[PDB]
Amino acid sequence: MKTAQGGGHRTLLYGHAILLRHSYSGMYLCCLSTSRSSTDKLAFDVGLQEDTTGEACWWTIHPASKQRSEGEKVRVGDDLILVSVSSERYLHLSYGNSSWHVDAAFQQTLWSVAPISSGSEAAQGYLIGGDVLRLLHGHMD
């Protein structure tokens, strides 16, 4: 199966192959082997799937700015370029489809990162921002 050989909590350095997993859908963001996606080019389409085998499901982070270059602790608020899988594609914002549209195009596009919730503390009787909770009034009903 997996048989992972890593302790974990390793900080992601520029050039490391990364894996993304959806916190809700449970799947992994990948570059689909299909085409079209309302586009007319050699590009591919982005989507989600379950199997992690194969060269897919992996993304490599490359620094857009020359200030950081390769092999650095990627801090927050930086700019990253994702290019991997089977076409060296980029998470390009195709605005030609009457609106913004992400497709596996060959033109690089800026993509920032943000910390959404947390990565350190568990529940521990601490209401986190964004969760399903109850609203009991009389403590019984």
């Binding site: 947390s118 503390e121 529940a123 521990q124 009787g125 601490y126 209401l127 909770l133 009034h137 009389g138």
Partner: protein
């Protein structure tokens, strides 16, 4: 307190606290009415 870029409060418990939710404009709002 406007900038929120980190928290270590753990002020409210999930099942060991009582909430008295107050709207910004009214003041109490939430209360049973039999």
């Amino acid at each position: 307190r406007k900038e929120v870029d980190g928290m270590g409060t753990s002020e409210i418990k999930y099942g060991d606290s009582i909430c008295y939710i107050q709207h910004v404009d009214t003041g109490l709002w939430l209360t049973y009415q039999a």
